[PDB]
Amino acid sequence: RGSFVEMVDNLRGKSGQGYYVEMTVGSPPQTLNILVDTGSSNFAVGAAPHPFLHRYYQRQLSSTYRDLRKGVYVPYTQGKWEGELGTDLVSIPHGPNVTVRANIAAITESDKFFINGSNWEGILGLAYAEIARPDDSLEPFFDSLVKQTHVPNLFSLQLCGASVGGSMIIGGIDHSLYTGSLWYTPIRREWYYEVIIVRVEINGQDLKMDCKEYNYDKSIVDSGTTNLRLPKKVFEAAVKSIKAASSTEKFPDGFWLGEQLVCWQAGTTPWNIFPVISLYLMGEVTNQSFRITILPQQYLRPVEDCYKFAISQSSTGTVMGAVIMEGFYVVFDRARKRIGFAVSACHVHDEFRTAAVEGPFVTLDMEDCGYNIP
Numbered sequence: 001r002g003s004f005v006e007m008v009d010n011l012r013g014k015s016g017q018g019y020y021v022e023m024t025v026g027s028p029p030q031t032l033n034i035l036v037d038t039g040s041s042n043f044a045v046g047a048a049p050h051p052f053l054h055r056y057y058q059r060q061l062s063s064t065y066r067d068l069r070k071g072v073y074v075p076y077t078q079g080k081w082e083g084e085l086g087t088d089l090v091s092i093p094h095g096p097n098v099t100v101r102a103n104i105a106a107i108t109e110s111d112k113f114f115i116n117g118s119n120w121e122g123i124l125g126l127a128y129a130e131i132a133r134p135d136d137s138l139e140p141f142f143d144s145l146v147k148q149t150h151v152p153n154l155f156s157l158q159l160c161g162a163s164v165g166g167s168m169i170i171g172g173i174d175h176s177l178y179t180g181s182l183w184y185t186p187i188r189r190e191w192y193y194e195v196i197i198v199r200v201e202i203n204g205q206d207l208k209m210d211c212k213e214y215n216y217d218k219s220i221v222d223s224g225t226t227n228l229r230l231p232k233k234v235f236e237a238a239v240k241s242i243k244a245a246s247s248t249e250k251f252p253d254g255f256w257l258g259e260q261l262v263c264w265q266a267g268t269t270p271w272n273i274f275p276v277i278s279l280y281l282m283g284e285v286t287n288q289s290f291r292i293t294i295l296p297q298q299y300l301r302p303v304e305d306c307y308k309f310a311i312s313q314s315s316t317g318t319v320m321g322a323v324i325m326e327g328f329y330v331v332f333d334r335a336r337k338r339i340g341f342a343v344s345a346c347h348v349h350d351e352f353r354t355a356a357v358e359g360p361f362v363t364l365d366m367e368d369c370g371y372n373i374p
């Protein structure tokens with residue numbers, strides 16, 4: 001507990017291409033780089049020579065492979081993958097020293113799934129059974145890990161932005177990875193990592209919307225998404241306020257919609273003109289909340305000095321992607337059904353402002369901020 005030297009820095013990636021951990025599948029062990037995804041629940045790996053791939057799972061080489069003789073078809077709006085379900089022995093070399101029999105979806109056809117130029121060849125879905133494909137009977141990797149070993153029902157993520165790195169601490173918390181205190185928000189329901197936003201501020205100025213709008217139709221913590229995604233009505237309000245606070249320089253309308261990049265001369269980026277963004281989350285106690293605050297260093301991300309505005313509209317509710325997660329050490333405390341936030345020791349800041357986790361605050365009717373099907 002508290003110190004996990006061997007797991008520090010077990011994550012790498014390229015900007016906008018996600019955060020991956022090294023994993024082994026089969027006997028003898030086949031090494032693969034696997035994207036860490038808190039927004040899905042399948043362990044799914046390339047199993048065929050797709051041209052984008054550095055390597056792939058070769059089931060014929062593994063003596064411990066067991067065929068489940070079942071297909072799986074996984075469409076999304078963003079793209080698709082399909083595969084063949086089986087089990088095999090899985091371990092994480094720079095994680096806990098254990099071997100687990102886990103479900104593996106062997107990917108045999110895909111579209112807009114793998115990224116051309118990326119260094120990963122699979123996905124680790126870290127969310128709950130309820131959103132696993134084809135159904136909730138397919139046990140997720142982390143569920144198998146906890147059931148079969150003595151690894152505690154907890155993991156934490158420190159994602160470090162602006163070639164990227166970070167840590168996945170499996171089974172615990174490393175105190176060197178954060179400054180100040182952890183503050184916990186309850187996991188509303190165990191499917192996605194669902195949370196409730198109770199208040200939103202831009203430079204400490206309340207957006208003054210019905211808090212139900214902030215969570216329409218849900219709010220989730222998702223390492224497999226880049227942007228801070230906000231529901232349409234919230235996005236419009238937030239951008240209006242962001243435009244106002246930054247109005248000392250005018251930018252084209254397309255920039256705020258992510259249709260254009262904006263550029264400055266090397267080293268001259270005017271961070272000071274861009275507001276901080278605060279999300280208040282439901283606390284552990286009745287009428288008690290806490291606030292997480294991110295900088296422009298989190299929401300304006302380098303494209304390679306040119307930047308993309310990485311807050312965008314959603315029809316799937318709030319998505320707290322890498323834009324949020326790069327500011328914070330995030331503790332997915334599955335055993336206590338809660339998520340902890342603390343200021344990340346690796347978050348990108350300047351001499352004037354840092355990311356913040358602050359509380360307690362007094363907020364009434366926080367339960368009403370949750371959305372239910374009418």
Ligand SMILES: C[C@]1(c2cc(NC(=O)c3cnc(OCF)cn3)ccc2F)N=C(N)SC[C@H]1c1ccccc1
Binds near residue numbers: 015075123
């Ligand atoms: C399953 C899925 C998914 C996500 C990613 N993500 C990334 O590439 C990525 C890139 N940058 C990030 O931060 C900054 F580095 C974070 N992540 C890659 C493949 C992938 F399957 N997970 C979701 N939670 S939402 C779309 C969904 C999806 C499903 C099918 C096709 C495409 C995406």
